[PDB]
Each structure stands twice: as C-alpha cells, then as structure tokens.
Design an enzyme around this catalytic site. Structure first.
Site, PDB file in Angstrom:
ATOM      1  CD  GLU A   6      -3.112  -0.810   0.105  1.00  0.00           C
ATOM      2  OE1 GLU A   6      -3.026   0.196  -0.646  1.00  0.00           O
ATOM      3  OE2 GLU A   6      -4.020  -1.716  -0.029  1.00  0.00           O
ATOM      4  CG  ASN A  39      -9.013   6.278  -4.498  1.00  0.00           C
ATOM      5  OD1 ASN A  39      -9.347   6.485  -3.306  1.00  0.00           O
ATOM      6  ND2 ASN A  39      -7.934   5.608  -4.842  1.00  0.00           N
ATOM      7  CG  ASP A  64     -14.213   7.340  -5.563  1.00  0.00           C
ATOM      8  OD1 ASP A  64     -13.154   7.916  -5.236  1.00  0.00           O
ATOM      9  OD2 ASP A  64     -14.813   6.541  -4.826  1.00  0.00           O
ATOM     10  CB  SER A 110     -12.387   8.917  -2.249  1.00  0.00           C
ATOM     11  OG  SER A 110     -11.956   7.745  -2.942  1.00  0.00           O
ATOM     12  CG  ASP A 155      -6.843   5.032  -1.106  1.00  0.00           C
ATOM     13  OD1 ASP A 155      -8.019   5.246  -0.832  1.00  0.00           O
ATOM     14  OD2 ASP A 155      -6.473   4.067  -1.819  1.00  0.00           O
ATOM     15  CG  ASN A 207     -11.434   5.586  -0.089  1.00  0.00           C
ATOM     16  OD1 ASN A 207     -12.619   5.900  -0.100  1.00  0.00           O
ATOM     17  ND2 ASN A 207     -10.613   5.838  -1.097  1.00  0.00           N
ATOM     18  CG  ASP A 231     -17.596  -2.655   7.037  1.00  0.00           C
ATOM     19  OD1 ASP A 231     -18.565  -2.273   7.740  1.00  0.00           O
ATOM     20  OD2 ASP A 231     -17.495  -2.436   5.806  1.00  0.00           O
TER      21      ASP A 231
END
Ligand SMILES: [Cl-]
Ligand SMILES: [Cl-]
Ligand SMILES: [Cl-]
Ligand SMILES: [Cl-]
Ligand code: NA
Length: 129
Positions: free
Chosen positions: A35, A46, A48, A50, A52, A59, A101
């Site tokens: 990562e 990203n 979209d 967003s 990281d 995110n 989650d």
C-alpha cells in the site's frame, strides 16, 4: 516516517494487530509494504475523487474526513491527516474497524492481489518480536 520492515512489525504487534480478527502479523506487514512502501506520509487520489491516506491507504469515501469528498462518511471519526503521523495509533485503530466490517482484509485490494494465499510469515522472519 519511513519504517523499517522489523520496526513496523514490532509497532503493529505493540498496538494489538497480531492475530486481530484472525489475521497474523505478516498479513499486516505485507499489506503496508504494497500500500505505502512503509511510508506514513503516502497519499493517492482515486478515480471517484476520494483519497487514500497513510501506511494502510485508508479511504476518505467511508473512513476519514478530508473536506473534499462529497457524500462521504467519516466512520473512524478522524481527520484524514491523522493517518499521516509518525505515530501509527490512528491508522491502527481505524484499520481494526475496517477489518471488522464483514469482508476481512479483502477491504484492501492490494492485500487480496499481492498478499492473500502467499507465505506472509516471510515478512516477519528474522525480526525480534
Ligand atoms: Cl522490505
Ligand atoms: Cl505471519
Ligand atoms: Cl468531505
Ligand atoms: Cl475474515
Ligand atoms: Na469522508
């Protein structure tokens, strides 16, 4: 801060990630390697809109607030900047919520594509722990 491999393994173990939700320590060290290359200051945008943030590339669409991600949540209740600190506490506490989650470590696409099914214990071999 750019951690060493065994340095980060030791910090993650002190903060309770070793075997958290059944994921051995080498899974967490492998995920951080791919990562962020162990760099707490890593950021990536990203498609979209967003972003990281940090060693585990958490995110802004779900987990942290950066003020520039429309219609997003802040489920870790933290500014995204907290995820860039030399102190890994905020990144660890938020990662514990993410992995709980329902999809486990599959939440991290780099873990699924580069770590899952591999000899992840190699990432902690040689380390004083
Ligand atoms: Cl390495
Ligand atoms: Cl391991
Ligand atoms: Cl926002
Ligand atoms: Cl699981
Ligand atoms: Na957000």
């Amino acid at each position: 801060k750019v951690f060493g491999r065994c340095e980060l393994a030791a910090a993650m173990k002190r903060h309770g990630l070793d075997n958290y939700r059944g994921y051995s320590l080498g899974n967490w060290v492998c995920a951080a390697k791919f990562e962020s290359n162990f760099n707490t200051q890593a950021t990536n945008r990203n498609t979209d809109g967003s972003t990281d943030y940090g060693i585990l590339q958490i995110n802004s669409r779900w987990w942290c607030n950066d003020g520039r991600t429309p219609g997003s949540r802040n489920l870790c209740n933290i500014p995204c900047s907290a995820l860039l600190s030399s102190d890994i506490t905020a990144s660890v506490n938020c990662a514990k919520k993410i992995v709980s989650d329902g999809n486990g470590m599959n939440a991290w696409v780099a873990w699924r594509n580069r770590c899952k099914g591999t000899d992840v214990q190699a990432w902690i071999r040689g380390c004083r722990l």
